[PDB]
């Protein structure tokens, strides 16, 4: 579901709600068209009508994602949904909660105001009010006249509202939808949604009935105001105290009242402004340029750039886009973030393999630099590694790049908290024909295990540079039979995670024995394979 992830968006939303409430209050309180109506109804008319105006906008804001899904189904296509990082996910729920609570507050105000209004309306019908109210209410009993008091039946003040709320539309639906709202809010409480889902998701589907009842709810135009045509003829400010001679004199013809227009839509302004503000926020956040901070060299062609950009969330295991207008004005190249979160730079490792990369050497001399533009951090996250106890890392060929992101990030969390780091040891196993042009990673391995030795610890270590074919080098295939057993016997109930990165030729060779090794019960030895998924 959509969200804004911005304090500016929240502020503009609150401002829009306040503005809508004030504007509709003034619109229904000031004009002389709603003179007799508000005279009979006190101040409850505006206090009851403005919250409905705000509630329509808030309810549409709630419902919008379902309309988006329906439109996507109609088109026959569907835009690729964004990934989850547990931060872009657990901030939309906050917005959902705030919108739901504001809907509840406005519904409470509207219900209280109309509950107050109905009492006066049914009290004025009977001979139990001031003379002006009872004189006004006794309209429409004859022909060629339209009523103003909707309680067109004299029973009593108590039990009169009970009959009114049942025999009259928009009163039964009001009760039905307020019960639905109460049930929806109560069902989604904590200790009911977290612990259970058969009673949260199933009951939360009362929103269809709630929305149907709301759509039916506004109809029959029960609240009536003086018609524009008859307003000029009536000349209200003169024929106001002559309540007892209406119709029987020429200057004061009997006024006629009609309901509100049945299709006006002035509240869309809200959803429209919120959308435009979100889009402008996205524009600002993406216009800022990127400034190169540190550029370094490496053996052969492994030039690495470190740049700082405002308002960037590196995350982990993602990929960004790089574009140099000097080399070409219409090309975006993808690269993998070889860095860690809570840092400042990017550290994207590029190696000359073609011509555009060489465009950063001849055009951008190394012995006053091109303006690099970075698009954003797309791609699915990789956080299951940080949520495990023991890990089984196995790289391969050119594809060890993303592992450098994890290693530079696991140690940082240790120096900060040293309690949430549930990792035990990185069983890193690097397989390659040669390390000819990957010296930037082998350097990192000795700069991590040795560096972290200062705090009197050698828990992970396990640098295992291995040679497949033609510095503990196996000089051959690292056979996996009995390899995992020796380390799986240390901790019962093994949750070892293996993250392969290589061709499918050796991929299925790892899961063939994993199922065989497993046995029933929450005690046996088993390592889970994620296959092509990381």
């Amino acid at each position, epitope marked *: 579901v959509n969200e804004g992830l911005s304090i500016f968006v929240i502020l503009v939303w609150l401002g829009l709600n306040v503005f809508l409430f004030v504007w509709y209050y003034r619109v229904y309180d000031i004009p002389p068209k709603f003179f007799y109506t508000r005279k009979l109804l006190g101040s409850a008319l505006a206090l009851a009508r403005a919250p409905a105006a705000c509630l329509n906008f808030n309810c549409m804001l709630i419902l919008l994602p379902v309309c988006r899904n329906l439109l996507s189904f109609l088109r026959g296509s569907s835009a690729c949904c964004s990934t989850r990082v547990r931060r872009q996910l657990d901030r939309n729920l906050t917005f959902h909660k705030m919108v739901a609570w504001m809907i509840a507050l406005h519904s409470a105000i509207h219900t209280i105001a109309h509950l107050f209004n109905v009492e006066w309306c049914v009290n004025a019908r009977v001979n139990n009010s001031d003379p002006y109210s009872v004189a006004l209410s006794e309209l429409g009993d004859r022909q060629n006249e339209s009523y103003l008091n909707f309680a067109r039946k004299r029973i009593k003040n108590p039990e009169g509202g009970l009959y009114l709320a049942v025999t009259l539309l928009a009163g039964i639906t009001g009760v039905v939808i307020t019960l639905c709202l109460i049930l929806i809010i109560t069902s989604s409480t904590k200790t009911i949604r977290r612990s259970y889902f058969e009673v949260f998701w199933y009951t939360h589907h009362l929103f269809v009935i709630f929305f149907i009842g709301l759509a039916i709810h506004g109809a029959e135009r029960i609240v009536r105001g003086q018609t524009a045509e008859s307003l000029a003829v009536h000349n209200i400010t*003169v024929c106001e105290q002559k309540i*007892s001679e*209406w*119709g*029987k*004199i020429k200057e004061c013809p009997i006024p006629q009242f009609a309901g509100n227009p049945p299709m006006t839509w002035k509240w869309i302004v809200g959803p429209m402004f919120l959308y435009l503000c979100e889009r402008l926020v996205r524009f600002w956040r993406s216009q800022q340029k990127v400034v190169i901070t540190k550029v370094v060299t490496h053996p052969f062609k492994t030039i690495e750039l470190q740049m700082k950009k405002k308002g960037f969330k590196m995350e982990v295991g993602q990929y960004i886009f790089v574009k140099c207008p000097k080399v070409s004005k219409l090309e975006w190249h993808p690269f993998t973030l070889t860095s860690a979160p809570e840092e400042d730079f990017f550290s994207i490792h590029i190696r000359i393999v073609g011509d555009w990369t060489e465009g950063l050497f001849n055009a951008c001399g190394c012995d006053k630099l091109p303006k690099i533009a970075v698009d954003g951090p797309f791609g699915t996250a990789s956080e299951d590694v940080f949520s495990y106890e023991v890990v089984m890392l196995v790289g391969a060929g050119i594809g060890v790049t993303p592992f450098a992101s994890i290693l530079k990030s696991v140690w940082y969390k240790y120096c900060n908290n040293a309690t949430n780091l549930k990792l035990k040891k990185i069983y890193f196993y690097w397989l390659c024909r040669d390390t000819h042009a990957f010296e930037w990673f082998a350097d990192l391995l000795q700069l991590l295990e040795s560096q972290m030795q200062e705090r009197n610890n050698a828990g992970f270590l396990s640098y295992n540079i291995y040679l497949t074919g033609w510095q503990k080098t196996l000089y051959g295939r690292p056979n996996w039979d009995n390899e995992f057993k020796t380390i799986a016997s240390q901790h019962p109930n093994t949750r070892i995670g293996v993250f392969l990165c290589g061709p499918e030729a050796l991929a299925e060779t790892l899961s063939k024995q994993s199922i065989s090794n497993s046995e029933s019960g929450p005690r046996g030895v088993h390592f889970i394979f994620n296959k092509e998924n990381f």
Partner: antibody
Amino acid sequence: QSLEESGGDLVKPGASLTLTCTASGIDFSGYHYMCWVRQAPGKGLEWIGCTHSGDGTTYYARWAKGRFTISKTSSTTVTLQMTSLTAADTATYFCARRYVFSGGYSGLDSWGPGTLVTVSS
Amino acid sequence: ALVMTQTPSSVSAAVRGTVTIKCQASENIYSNLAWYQQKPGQPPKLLIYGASKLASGVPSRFKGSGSGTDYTLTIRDLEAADAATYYCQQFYDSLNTDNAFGGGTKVEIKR
């Protein structure tokens, strides 16, 4: 429940006069009109101007527009002011209350006696 | 703008007879009439209002009926001390009018 007015006598042509109508037992309040009429000596009754106790709405006959002014003072006195008197206005003047009966229909009850306004040189 | 006239100017009826007076307007006034009786002395006294109802203390002999633009008053049981002048007034239009009080009738006792 009884009205009474006075303040008219022989005046020279072209002058101005004011007649005041007072009542005992009646409070000039509510929504009952106050309605001034006059009658020529031995002729039919004529309608001059006839105001409203509530608010300040006033109405006048076509022949007596602007020349006559009606005001309500102290909630118990009503004054009619006439300007540029001629020889035609030498008639008796009545002060009457336009009671608005239940339902809407109205009548002219609780009249007051006359006041022989005469204009001559 | 609005003209209201009485059809008979002076009717004559013997004691124990009948009297009929017709007041007709120039527009459809929604039965907002009122009939007054004026003796040679005293101010005129109201008889009926609304063209059909009765005042307080008036004998039920006086009768009025009509609709639209034509209205009528019928006198039952004419007797002594009933020779006076009768007027019809319209409480409908009071912003463009000249008299709004009818013309009057001069019923007198015949003996």
